[PDB]
Design a protein around this ligand. Structure first.
Ligand SMILES: C[C@H](CCC(=O)NCCC[N+](C)(C)C[C@H](O)CS(=O)(=O)O)[C@H]1CC[C@H]2[C@@H]3[C@H](O)C[C@@H]4C[C@H](O)CC[C@]4(C)[C@H]3C[C@H](O)[C@]12C
Ligand SMILES: Nc1ncnc2c1ncn2[C@@H]1O[C@H](COP(=O)(O)OP(=O)(O)O)[C@@H](O)[C@H]1O
Ligand SMILES: [Mg+2]
Ligand SMILES: [Zn+2]
Ligand SMILES: [Zn+2]
Ligand SMILES: [Zn+2]
Ligand SMILES: [Zn+2]
Lengths: 185, 590, 529, 75, 186
RNA sequence: UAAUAGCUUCUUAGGAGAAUGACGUAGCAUGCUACGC
RNA sequence: GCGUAGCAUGCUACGUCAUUCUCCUAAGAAGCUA
């Protein structure tokens, strides 16, 4: 086992095995068995305390890993579990959530919680004329795969604004972004 | 604890010991760092010293690991193996490791002492992470060397919860910082060795200090504490956000018929709009501090945080926004220190408003929609990293001129720094050119601007004004008394004593001098409002008494002369000693 | 106390995405599945603690029947006659965990360890002897629980401070640890469900029942609707072992301290002191045992009501008609104890109404013929008793009756039981709800428990707890154990991979090989150990 | 597996909302925990899904606490 | 162990053994000296094995005494904290009305539930909805516990100030209920 | 902020006991040898 | 035939060490139930 006392034991092995290969008699055989036993014992001792060294190192390593990974798991988790939320949210693949967060990417985020009862108020900001063109047609407003009708269009100036002037050549004239108030149909 | 390597970003746990900032370092990278430089100490999760009862062999290529401890050549176990073998240093994540050739610049970065003027050049052309590490160790070395410490000793031990302190009179004392450290210096005969690493926060009663130590040894009567080394915050954000080019306007909402004054820069507000970060360069007094308010009134619905490295620039920006922006919600942020007076006419300390006014060292960790960094001439890489780590916005605006003064850099005493090596933004605006520009002087009269339009700029700057012909050039000795290691010139303030009685239109003048001592003593002599060259950058001054004191490489630079003379909007008196600088100015000759 | 009312919420649980992905990759959580997630970590708003303390409004001042309670007390004491108890010195009281809280205001300065270490045995005995002739009113906190459950209402536990807890331990711990060290009795506290302990309990239930039938009831709002009288009775029955160590005034003052520190005292609900109308605080030193006494009382009262409410002329057994006659004359015509008849009635109850109690869960193997005739308590008798002595209604919807003895009780301690074959004979194995086990695996209450590779003991313990599912006839019930086993296998494999990447040496004695083969969990439910 | 899949998404979304200190606003936290406890106790795919939409809208209204654009190109 | 005189005896016996090995003396002399070496070993090994457990028990007693000293130092700190808390709460007491109601008592004993009812100078009402606000503390003054209280402050569940004109029937949904009004005895 | 009680798993440390094996010392018995009687 | 001394074998007692098992205590981590 690559130790000097292992060399003592290995030479006791060779010597007394050769003696048994002769094996005649008797006194040298018994005395050599005694020497083999004492070499066995003195090797056995530091082999066992070597056990203790590697297991003490098992404390060292296991404590080491547990504590490091402890605030390894703490430091990442907040942003990392936001990433988990988005990966696992994206795994759902529901057209309502897809529509809603692809509208959130362009800046069309709602200003309050989306109500679920019929005919309840939702206010969401419109950041572009293209975003208005895609979602609002006529006086209707499609969002979260749902139908909404318009109560407000209103701009950043908080000036009461009406529905017709939002057009191709009149769009830069608007005070962007616009805030819509809608009810659910 | 584990970490990431500097020049390869691999997982590692081997800190270097003799590097000034105590960074995290790799396996092969650390082998190359300790095999080529004088740094020999390496900090794993446990220090790499010998574990004999008495032995000091801290070199890593030199020990052996047997069992679970570190032993020297004399105290080695029969079964062991050296730490530095096979080209690596023994540590965690051994074969999950990759190296690089960034050690050729890393060795020079970690080895230099930052008093030369070539290491500053090296610290601005290499890769981004080595740039950040070089700036961090620059700040650390500055805090070690300049304004270092005063010797302190402990008279007696009251308890382990509260300590006794005795500063040595004759040197100043640094205050509480957990970032600061007072290394134990029982230096007598008798173990001139680190007995630990300490910081000191003082109590409100008696003569006591409630310390925080990192060692388990009681104090001796002769143990001392002198502040050697400092730990600055390890920032992560790059100096510059990577550029991304846009096609249409994103995140911003323009206005039609914004005003009359900003109508010339509307195309400028677009080009700010569809870029991630844009840079503006212009000679002083051309409207760089005005372009931020132009951006504000071109993008009204978006929050903009306005921030600069100093307080004078953000206060002049306060003034211009005070005349052009709505007063109702505008902001201003003062730190918890509250050391100096600020522009206290808006809401002071309201971070949730649309126009936030602040200084780089005191920003809150919030978002924005446009960030406008003013006067990068005062900005180092540390300040850029601070504003990048704390402010998180869609658009960055970098306005400033490298021809004005760079950062103090008090370690820099040999060599000369080019304007393009002040920071990363200066390297951008001088190498590939600024994105957009203005040069036309509306501040100093045609005479003095024609003088300065040959020294720093070679005739690319005209003016729209008159030669008012009160730019008086005088040449005298001005005997120099060297009192406080800052120049004081009593005869210079004397010729100024008796050349103020002859001029009735100069009783409102402002005294300017490149030396703070004479600058301050000029207050009781002649009673004019009094400012230095460094702190007068940004505000417009009617009459200026500039007084160049000595002949050296400190006060005879053309840049500080430029900023000191160009703040006189209608007239200036300049005192002098030089002859190369007097040969090229076009002033009234006296 | 403080100038603003504090509102305390409950955070939601923390999702273990690795375990859930491994589960859904093994054919779990479909439609048409008999096993889906039903135990979650429910969150609460800031009005949780105050709206849960409001449930004490269900506790009305209840005047119990006194000529019958003074005999149910004797029957309960006969049920509690095998054990021994008394007062013990401060050097004999043993605490299980010293890092637990010490109530108000002692939580501001440290845990309970500070108060068990700062106080010597001498001034601990001094305090205990002070409480035997003095009354110490006590503030008890209400702590919101962060635990997995199947319904959304917030559960609260009452945190009793250390001053009451230490004295109550010194008073009651001898009896409380004598109960938890006896096997084969009515109150099964301290008996494991492992190593064939469930089978032993369930065969001690079936000890001389004539025509066996299984029954188990449920107390709605058990800890908040109990009358003060039944709690005082439980405290007195638990204090009937101090007939040698304690005097009479000492026992009365100990009962007064228990009522002043447990029953009706000031309750702290978010920095505000209210008044507890009554009922047990479920965090004192004697809660499972006192609740067991209360449950045995309700069972005996139901039996007495069923026996007296029977007609009498319809009584076929001529002895038990005489037993009912003697029961009435010992209830409403005698003022002293009739120990012979108390022994006879207790033997009758143990012969026809064998029970098994752990603090609110009872499995009874009552006589079916006598119950059909009406001579032992049935479901309707318990409903009436809970109506007129507990001020709650016991609906049949959550109380079961099992007519087949080969499948055991429907639910005891939230563990369904079934008859399996082990070796050559048949034993009963308790299997939990697999939704509960899957919810515990999927929803951890911390971030360090999400990574998995740090904690193999969590999944080993869960596999130990959910081993009996393999012997269930339904296949995807049995698939949970193999899911957990393969998860432990993968977890160990990737832990070894990570510790091979973060070092260069692979663990010399990686001892984990027995955790992913079923011998370690099969030996858990064998009666040898 | 579409049903046991939403019930965990509500848990992680409420954990993220608690991370961003919606807990400091009692009024908003009211329907945040309301929708969370109602989605956990759900039977059909629908009401689970637009209650999911309503609960995610809380995270949607938040300009600076989230930055929506990073957490959805690389995934 | 390695410092014991029996180690010196074992060492000189082993030195004698190696010297006799180098000398090659007779078998009887070698056997006698081996007997001496073996009895020296039997003495010293036993004594060292005795001293090992002695070091173990010494360390155990040392640890127990160190823990007891730290327990004493924690006991002093918690005693000081409890004393300071008690004396500060004494400084918070309103002694005049308390003295009045105690002197009014016969035995000097009064119920605890009436101490704040008759001596507390500041009152807080927690109000779950608008109807209870209209029923218990409408206006700027109200009457509870046979006294007159004036409302000094109104805060919602988020500890934000709510002005008394903000609490209306139509404006109730915009308030973060419950409302914690704070009043002082007049 | 995080209660009482019970059960179970795992890890370490210490003690005690048991069993097996090895070495050393002392005692008893048998066989043999040297010398003396 | 006896004694002393020596060697071999067997047995007993004691000291030490290695291995395995059981228990008793302490500490720590975790799970389940009321
Ligand atoms: C002796 C052992 C391996 C023996 C070996 O196999 N040699 C031969 C070469 C092996 N190969 C594969 C390189 C070829 C080496 C290798 C990795 C070493 C540990 C960790 O690093 C650090 C850890 C933290 C602290 O520092 C305290 C000690 C710890 C426990 C270390 C103990 C020990 O010292 C380990 C196991
Ligand atoms: N287009 C303009 N028309 C009139 N005045 C201007 C115009 N642009 C700038 N100014 C004036 O010039 C001054 C420039 O100040 P500042 O912005 O500090 O210059 P710089 O930043 O280039 O040093 C402002 O005070 C402003 O009043
Ligand atoms: Mg300017
Ligand atoms: Zn170094
Ligand atoms: Zn590296
Ligand atoms: Zn050494
Ligand atoms: Zn007693």
């Amino acid at each position: 086992s690559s130790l000097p006392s292992y060399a003592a034991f290995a030479t006791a092995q060779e010597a007394y095995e050769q003696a048994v290969a002769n094996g005649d008699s008797e006194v040298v055989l018994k005395k050599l068995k005694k020497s083999l036993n004492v070499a066995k014992s003195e090797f056995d001792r530091d082999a066992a305390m070597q056990r203790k060294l590697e297991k003490m190192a098992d404390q060292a390593m296991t404590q080491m890993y547990k504590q490091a990974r402890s605030e390894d798991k703490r430091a990442k988790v907040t942003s990392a579990m936001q990433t988990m939320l988005f990966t696992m949210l994206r795994k759902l693949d529901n057209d309502a959530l897809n529509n809603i967060i692809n509208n959130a990417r362009d800046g069309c985020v709602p200003l309050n919680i989306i109500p679920l009862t019929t005919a309840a108020k939702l206010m969401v900001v419109i950041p572009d004329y293209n975003t208005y063109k895609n979602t609002c047609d006529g006086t209707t407003f499609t969002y979260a795969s749902a139908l909404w009708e318009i109560q407000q269009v209103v701009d950043a100036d908080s000036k009461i604004v009406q529905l017709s002037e939002i057009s191709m050549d009149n769009s830069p004239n608007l005070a962007w972004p616009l805030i819509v108030t809608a009810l659910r149909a | 604890a584990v970490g990431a390597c500097v020049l390869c970003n691999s997982q590692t746990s081997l800190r270097c010991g003799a590097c000034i900032r105590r960074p995290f370092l790799c396996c092969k990278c650390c082998y190359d760092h300790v095999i080529s430089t004088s740094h020999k100490l390496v900090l794993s999760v446990n220090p790499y010293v010998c574990n004999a009862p008495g032995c000091d062999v801290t070199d890593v290529t030199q020990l052996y690991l047997g069992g679970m401890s570190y032993y020297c050549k004399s105290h080695k176990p029969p079964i062991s193996f050296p730490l530095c073998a096979n080209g690596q240093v023994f540590g965690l994540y051994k074969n999950t490791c990759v190296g690089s050739d960034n050690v050729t610049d890393f060795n020079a970065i970690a080895t230099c002492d930052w008093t030369n003027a070539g290491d500053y050049i090296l610290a601005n052309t290499c890769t981004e992470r080595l740039k950040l590490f070089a700036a961090e160790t620059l700040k650390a070395t500055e805090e070690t060397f300049k304004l270092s410490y005063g010797i302190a000793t402990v008279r007696e031990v009251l308890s382990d919860r509260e300590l006794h302190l005795s500063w040595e009179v004759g040197k100043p004392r640094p205050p509480l910082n957990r970032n600061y450290v007072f290394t134990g210096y029982r230096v007598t005969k008798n173990s001139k060795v680190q007995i630990g690493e300490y910081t000191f926060e003082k109590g409100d009663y008696g003569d006591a200090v409630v310390y925080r130590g990192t060692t388990t040894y009681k104090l001796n009567v002769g143990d001392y504490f002198v502040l050697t080394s400092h730990t600055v915050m390890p920032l992560s954000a790059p100096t510059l956000v990577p550029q991304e080019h846009y096609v249409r306007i994103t995140g911003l909402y323009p206005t039609l018929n914004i005003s009359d004054e900003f109508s010339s820069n509307v195309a400028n507000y677009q080009k700010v709009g569809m870029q991630k970060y844009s840079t503006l360069q212009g000679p002083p007094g051309t409207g760089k501090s005005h372009f931020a308010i132009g951006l504000a009134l071109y993008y009204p619905s978006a929050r903009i945080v306005y921030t600069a490295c100093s307080h004078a620039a953000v206060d002049a920006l306060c003034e211009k926004a005070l005349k052009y922006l709505p007063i109702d919600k505008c902001s201003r942020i003062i730190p918890a220190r509250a050391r100096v007076e600020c522009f206290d006419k808006f809401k002071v300390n309201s971070t949730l408003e649309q126009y936030v006014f602040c200084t780089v060292n005191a920003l809150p960790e919030t978002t924005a929609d446009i960030v406008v960094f003013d006067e990068i001439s005062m900005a180092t890489n540390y300040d850029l990293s601070v504003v990048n780590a704390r402010l998180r916005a869609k658009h960055y605006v970098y306005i400033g001129d490298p021809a004005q003064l760079p950062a103090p850099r008090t370690l820099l005493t040999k060599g000369t720094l080019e304007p393009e090596y002040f920071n990363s933004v200066c390297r951008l605006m001088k190498t590939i050119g600024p994105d957009m520009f203005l040069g036309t002087c509306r501040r100093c009269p045609a005479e003095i601007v024609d003088t300065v339009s040959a020294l720093v700029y070679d005739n690319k700057l005209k003016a729209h004004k008159d030669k008012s012909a009160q730019c008086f050039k005088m040449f005298y000795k001005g005997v120099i008394t060297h009192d406080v290691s800052s120049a004081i010139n009593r005869p210079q303030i004397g010729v100024v004593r008796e050349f103020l009685t002859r001029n009735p239109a100069w009783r409102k003048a402002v005294f300017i001098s490149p030396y703070n001592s004479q600058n301050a003593v000029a207050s009781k002599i002649l009673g004019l409002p009094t400012q230095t060259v460094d702190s007068s950058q940004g505000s417009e001054y009617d009459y200026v008494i500039f007084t160049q004191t000595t002949e050296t490489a400190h006060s005879c630079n053309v840049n500080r002369f430029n900023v000191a003379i160009t703040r006189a909007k209608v007239g200036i008196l300049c005192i002098m000693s030089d002859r190369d600088l007097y040969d090229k100015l076009q002033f009234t000759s006296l | 106390l403080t100038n603003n009312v504090a509102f305390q919420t409950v955070k939601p649980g923390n999702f273990n995405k690795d375990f859930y992905d491994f589960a859904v990759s093994k054919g779990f959580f479909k439609e048409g599945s008999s096993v889906e997630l039903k135990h979650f970590f429910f969150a609460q708003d800031g009005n949780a603690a105050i709206s849960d303390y409001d449930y004490y409004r269900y506790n009305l001042p209840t005047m119990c029947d006194i000529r019958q309670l003074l005999f149910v007390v004797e029957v309960v004491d006969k049920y509690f006659d095998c054990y021994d108890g008394g007062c013990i010195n401060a050097n004999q009281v043993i605490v299980n965990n010293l890092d637990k809280s010490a109530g108000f205001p002692f939580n501001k300065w440290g845990k309970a360890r500070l108060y068990y270490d700062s106080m010597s045995y001498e001034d601990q005995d001094a305090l205990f002897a002070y409480t035997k002739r003095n009354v110490i009113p006590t503030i008890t906190q209400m702590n919101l629980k962060y635990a997995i459950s199947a319904k959304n209402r917030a559960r609260t536990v009452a945190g009793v401070s250390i001053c009451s807890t230490m004295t109550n331990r010194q008073f009651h711990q001898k009896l409380l640890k004598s109960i938890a060290a006896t096997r084969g009795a009515t109150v099964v506290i301290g008996t494991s469900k492992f190593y064939g302990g469930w089978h032993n309990m369930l065969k001690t239930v079936y000890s001389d029942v004539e025509n066996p039938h299984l029954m188990g009831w449920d107390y709605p709002k058990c800890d908040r609707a109990m009358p003060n009288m039944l709690r005082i009775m439980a405290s007195l029955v638990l204090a009937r072992k101090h007939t040698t160590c304690c005097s009479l005034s000492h026992r009365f003052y100990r009962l007064a301290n228990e009522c002043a520190q447990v029953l009706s005292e000031m309750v702290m609900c978010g920095g505000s002191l209210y008044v507890k109308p009554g009922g047990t605080s479920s965090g004192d030193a004697t809660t499972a045992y006192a609740n067991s006494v209360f449950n045995i009382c309700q069972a005996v009262t139901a039996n007495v009501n069923a026996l007296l409410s029977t007609d009498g002329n319809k009584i076929a057994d001529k002895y038990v008609r005489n037993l009912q006659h003697r029961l009435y004359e010992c209830l409403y015509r005698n003022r002293d104890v009739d120990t012979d008849f108390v022994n006879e009635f207790y033997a009758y109850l143990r012969k026809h109404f064998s029970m098994m109690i752990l603090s609110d869960d009872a499995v009874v193997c009552f006589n079916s013929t006598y119950a059909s005739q009406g001579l032992v308590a049935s479901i309707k008798n318990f409903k009436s008793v809970l109506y007129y002595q507990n001020n709650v209604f016991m609906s049949e919807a959550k109380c079961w009756t099992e007519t087949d003895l080969t499948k055991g009780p429907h639910e005891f301690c939230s563990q369904h039981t079934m008859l399996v074959k082990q070796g050559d004979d048949y034993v009963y194995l308790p299997y939990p709800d697999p939704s509960r086990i899957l919810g515990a695996g999927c929803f951890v209450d911390d971030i360090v428990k999400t990574d998995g590779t740090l904690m193999i003991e969590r999944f080993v313990s869960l596999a130990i707890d959910a081993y009996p599912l393999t012997k269930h006839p339904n296949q995807e019930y049995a698939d949970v154990f193999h899911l957990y086993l393969q998860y432990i296998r993968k977890l160990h494999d990737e832990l070894t991979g990570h510790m091979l990447d973060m070092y260069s040496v692979m663990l010399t004695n990686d001892n984990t090989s027995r955790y992913w083969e079923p011998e370690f969990y099969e030996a858990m439910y064998t009666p040898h150990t | 597996s579409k049903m046991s899949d939403v019930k965990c998404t509500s848990v992680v979304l409420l954990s993220v909302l608690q991370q961003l200190r919606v807990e400091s606003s009692s009024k908003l936290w009211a329907q945040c925990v309301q929708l969370h406890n109602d989605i956990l106790l759900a039977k059909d795919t629908t009401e689970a899904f637009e209650k999911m939409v309503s609960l995610l809208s809380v995270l949607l209204s938040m300009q600076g606490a989230v930055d929506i654009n990073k957490l959805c190109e690389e995934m």
